[PDB]
Design a protein around this ligand. Structure first.
Ligand SMILES: Nc1ncnc2c1ncn2[C@@H]1O[C@H](CSCC[C@H](N)C(=O)O)[C@@H](O)[C@H]1O
Length: 325
């Protein structure tokens, strides 16, 4: 079976994607500094997540893990750091550079590496350093930008992905991943928002406040159940308006802008629930947090930093093909 090290594990999107890809995978360790993430991780996947600063990992640590696949969703922003006080710096994006500095020292280089990051990572100095050390350590690296709405998922979430195979001299391309998306177009199989919504819940706690709608309401992106996309969810969702996620019109008004000026409260606008956000990001229904100390408000923040499980399941399948499972 494949021993996997899941770095920057969060609530375990990578583990869920490995499950979908039917990889016989043993997550040897999941590492995250956020105890709230680890609490959700361990409740759902088993006690595999450990509290550890990835910037302190040594080659002896990686040797003990002895993992053939490493996954990571590192924290690399800001891509260009400012400031002369390199003395007092907390290890932030130092953790990713620590991985790159320690990798050439391990006893057994991992045969497969999967890296996920935000769009624009590809132009960063960190990406330049990553390509350099991977090339020097004999990896074949392919990379690309992919969004769920390329796979018939009605959500925008463009992300950079790097897939690396050690000592691989064949031919592959990130675009091969589309041979896995069963999706086609018939217009009745095109997924829309309604396919992810919860139904007949009490929406009171999710209704957008009139105070926010009166002050900033023109900045919302409003979608309806029949919409074929919605905007990217972030940590700011339900707190910051612009650029943090779309909201849902529950009323039947066809002309949303016209009704907005007439009476914006009659649009019955609500936030997506955290369950709906999880569904749009490809998490299965088994994902649970009710039995934890983690509130739905905190779940929005954890989900805002999570991968799309569906997209990564396809990339994992592509990455691990030479293992002939
Ligand atoms: N130096 C460091 N050491 C360990 N974990 C870190 C870290 N810096 C950031 N992280 C963690 O890395 C995660 C980046 S978001 C990744 C979440 C995960 N990919 C998922 O799908 O759920 C956050 O949970 C954050 O707590």
């Amino acid at each position: 079976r494949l021993r996997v090290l899941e770095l920057y594990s969060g609530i375990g999107g990578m583990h869920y994607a490995l499950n979908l890809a039917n990889i016989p995978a043993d997550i040897v360790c999941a590492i995250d500094i956020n105890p709230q993430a680890n609490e959700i991780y361990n409740l759902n996947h088993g006690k595999l997540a450990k509290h550890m600063d990835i910037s302190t990992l040594t080659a002896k640590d990686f040797d003990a893990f002895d993992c053939k696949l490493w996954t990571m969703s590192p924290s690399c922003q800001p891509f260009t750091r400012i400031g002369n006080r390199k003395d007092i710096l907390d290890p932030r994006s130092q953790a990713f550079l620590n991985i790159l500095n320690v990798l050439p020292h391990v006893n057994n280089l991992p045969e497969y590496i999967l890296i996920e990051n935000v769009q624009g990572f590809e132009e960063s100095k960190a990406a330049e350093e990553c390509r350099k050390v991977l090339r020097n350590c004999g990896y074949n690296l392919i990379e690309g930008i992919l969004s769920p709405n390329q796979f018939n998922i009605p959500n925008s979430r463009s992300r950079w992905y790097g897939l690396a195979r050690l000592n691989f001299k064949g031919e592959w391309s990130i675009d091969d991943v589309f041979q896995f998306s069963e999706v086609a177009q018939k217009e009745g199989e095109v997924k829309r928002i309604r396919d992810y919504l919860e139904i007949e819940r009490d929406w009171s706690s999710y209704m957008v406040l009139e105070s926010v709608l009166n002050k900033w309401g023109h900045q919302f992106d409003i979608v309806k159940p029949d919409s074929s996309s919605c905007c990217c969810f972030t940590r700011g969702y339900t707190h910051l308006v612009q650029g943090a996620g779309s909201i849902l019109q529950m009323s039947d008004h066809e002309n949303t802008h016209e009704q907005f000026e007439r009476n914006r409260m009659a649009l019955q606008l609500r936030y997506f629930t955290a369950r709906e956000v999880a569904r749009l990001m490809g998490f299965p229904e088994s994902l649970e947090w009710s039995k934890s100390n983690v509130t739905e408000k905190c779940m929005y923040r954890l989900l805002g930093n999570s991968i799309n499980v569906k997209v990564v399941s396809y990339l994992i399948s592509l990455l691990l093909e030479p293992l002939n499972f």
